[PDB]
C-alpha cells in the first residue's frame, strides 16, 4: 500500500473540523429549493437591523414592556442625564439582549461602528432639543451635559422627522474588542441630555416617551465563534 504516517489529530473528533464523510442515504431524491423571500447570507445582516433597547431595567420595569420606554417631561432645563449606558454591546444589560447583542454573544470579538437611533413618541404639539453623546473611554464618565458635549454628539431637534441617529464611530485601541466587560477593550459612554427642554402648549401631555434603537454599520464584524451564556439546560 502507499506508505503513510498518521499525524496528531487522527481519529478525533474536533467539532470544528471540515471533512468528508459517507452518505447514509445514497441517491436520495432531494427536494429542490424554491425562491423563498428573506434569504440571509451573513449574521451581520441581522445586526444591521434596528432593534429596540430595554433602557430602563429598574426593579419594577425590567422584564415588562415599560423597560423599553424612556420617560421625558416638560420640566425646566437641567444638565443632568436622561440616560447613561456603557458601550459594551454584548455585556451591558441594556444592549446584550438586543439582536446585535444576542449575535455578539456567539462571538468572542467585535469591531466596527454602531448607531443609536431615537424615536420621539410625544404629541405633535410637543417640541424640544436633546443632546445625544458618545464619549470614548479613559476619562470620568459624563454625568453633566458640560462633559458629554465635549465628546462625539448629535443635537437633536424634535420635529416632523420623528427620529434622530447618532453614529458611534469605531474608536478603539485594539483591532477588535472582547464581547465581555473588560477594561482593556472598554468602549466608552453613551448618554442623552436635555439641550433646551421639552415644551408643550396647554391641553397636551407633559410627559412622554422616547424609544431607542441600536444597529451595526456596514463596517461591523465579529469573529471567534463561541457558545452563548444566554441559554442553558439544567440537568
Amino acid at each position: 500500500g502507499l506508505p503513510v504516517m498518521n499525524t496528531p489529530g487522527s481519529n478525533q473528533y474536533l467539532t470544528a473540523d471540515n471533512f468528508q464523510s459517507p452518505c447514509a442515504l445514497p441517491e436520495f431524491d432531494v427536494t429542490p429549493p424554491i425562491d423563498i423571500p428573506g434569504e440571509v447570507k451573513n449574521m451581520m445582516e441581522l445586526a444591521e437591523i434596528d432593534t429596540m433597547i430595554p433602557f430602563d431595567l429598574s426593579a419594577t420595569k425590567k422584564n415588562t414592556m415599560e423597560m423599553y420606554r424612556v420617560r421625558l417631561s416638560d420640566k425646566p432645563h437641567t444638565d443632568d442625564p436622561i440616560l447613561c449606558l456603557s458601550l459594551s454591546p454584548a455585556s451591558d444589560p441594556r444592549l446584550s439582549h438586543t439582536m446585535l447583542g444576542e449575535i455578539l454573544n456567539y462571538y468572542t470579538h467585535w469591531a466596527g461602528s454602531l448607531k443609536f437611533t431615537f424615536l420621539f413618541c410625544g404629541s405633535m404639539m410637543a417640541t424640544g432639543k436633546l443632546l445625544v453623546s458618545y464619549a470614548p473611554p479613559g476619562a470620568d464618565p459624563p454625568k453633566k451635559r458640560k462633559e458629554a458635549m465635549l465628546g462625539t454628539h448629535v443635537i437633536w431637534d424634535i420635529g416632523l422627522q420623528s427620529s434622530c441617529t447618532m453614529v458611534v464611530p469605531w474608536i478603539s485601541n485594539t483591532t477588535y474588542r472582547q464581547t465581555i466587560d473588560d477594561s482593556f477593550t472598554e468602549g466608552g459612554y453613551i448618554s442623552v441630555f436635555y439641550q433646551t427642554r421639552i415644551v408643550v402648549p396647554l391641553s397636551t401631555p407633559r410627559e412622554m416617551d422616547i424609544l431607542g434603537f441600536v444597529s451595526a454599520c456596514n463596517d461591523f464584524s465579529v469573529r471567534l465563534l463561541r457558545d452563548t451564556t444566554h441559554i442553558e439546560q439544567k440537568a
Binding site: 426593579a59 419594577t60 444589560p93 439582549h97 466587560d181 477594561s183 482593556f184 451564556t229
Partner: protein
C-alpha cells in the same frame, strides 16, 4: 478540593446596607489560581458585580455595590460584597462564583432575606 463558603441565608435590613459573605476555602495542600469573582442576581442574563485579579472591579450600578475585601493584585479569596440601601426589590437568591484554575468555577447560592 477547592470549595466555596457562604451562608445559606443573609438578613437583610430595609433601607440599611448588608454584607453578603462569600469566601473560598482552599485546602493548603493543593494550589489554585482564582482569576475573578462574580456576583449575580438569580437569572439576570448576566452579572451584577464582578471583581478581577488585575482588572479590578465592575458594577451594574456602581453607587450601590462594593466588594468588601477583594483587593487588586492580591490572591482572591474573599468575595464578600456589601450592598447599600436595601429595598424590597432587593430580596432574592444571589449566586456568588469564583473563577479558579485548574479546578474550574465554583459557586454557591445566597438567599438575601430582607426584613424590617
Amino acid at each position: 478540593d477547592v470549595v466555596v463558603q457562604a451562608p445559606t441565608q443573609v438578613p437583610g435590613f430595609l433601607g440599611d446596607s448588608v454584607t453578603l459573605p462569600c469566601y473560598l476555602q482552599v485546602p493548603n495542600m493543593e494550589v489554585t489560581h482564582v482569576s475573578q469573582l462574580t456576583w449575580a442576581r438569580h437569572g439576570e442574563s448576566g452579572s451584577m458585580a464582578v471583581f478581577h485579579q488585575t482588572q479590578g472591579p465592575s458594577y451594574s450600578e456602581s453607587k450601590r455595590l462594593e466588594f468588601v475585601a477583594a483587593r487588586l493584585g492580591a490572591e482572591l479569596r474573599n468575595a464578600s460584597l456589601r450592598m447599600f440601601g436595601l429595598r424590597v426589590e432587593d430580596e432574592g437568591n444571589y449566586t456568588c462564583l469564583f473563577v479558579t484554575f485548574p479546578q474550574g468555577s465554583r459557586s454557591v447560592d445566597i438567599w438575601l432575606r430582607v426584613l424590617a
